[PDB]
């Protein structure tokens, strides 16, 4: 809807930064709205959904098991590890690591998962072989959140991300069991409260994954819809601003308000 684009334009003016926006119909796959669809933005934590999608792909092929237990040590813990820092002794299963990586955005969990698939290169290789020749991951946590201007490392485009996410959640790649698991994790998101979820009316379905980083970086991907059922994928990115966390969240609030209003 045009008014939603106005909210995005208002956001660019008041934040002093670029904003990426894609509105994608989950049923048909037709884009309903776009803003800077072919420009690159830092993925930040949003890649973690893609990461666990690759892991689940290995689960389907029998190359990985969700119940497989992994142990690690103190020297594996990086910044922000709210879940993994509490299981140094008992370790964690692969299923728990993806749960921690998506719902709590655990960084160490993300790194351990990247080890299971063979690093950022293999995640990129996975995305390449499923049709996404655009999205790329180059570094580990937390260096991937650097968000240096004009740096293409660890970046996606709003169009590439939205189409890729659709293939994971409602495509032919994963099994029905794996598709359901991935969107179950996203629905249990704990760290995206004051964003899209804050805008939604009662009874709405939402499965999302937020993002934040350096140099006014912020992002979010989501699969949502009214009547307790997902009907649309929304991708929002922004970078380069010097605005605080609160104002960046407020712009997403304003954009979301128009999105739901003109649903």
Curated annotation (Swiss-Prot):
Gene Ontology MF, one: beta-lactamase activity
Active site positions: 45 (acyl-ester intermediate), 143 (proton acceptor)
GO annotation terms (biological process): beta-lactam antibiotic catabolic process; response to antibiotic
Binding site for substrate: 209-211
Coiled coil ranges: none
Annotated consequence of substituting residue 79 to K: In TEM-3, TEM-4, TEM-6, TEM-8, TEM-16 and TEM-24
Claim: Mitochondrion is one of the keywords in the record: no
Entry-linked Gene3D superfamilies: DD-peptidase/beta-lactamase superfamily (3.40.710.10)
The reaction(s) this protein catalyses: a beta-lactam + H2O = a substituted beta-amino acid
Name of protein: Beta-lactamase TEM
Lineage, highest ranks first: Bacteria, Pseudomonadati, Pseudomonadota, Gammaproteobacteria, Enterobacterales
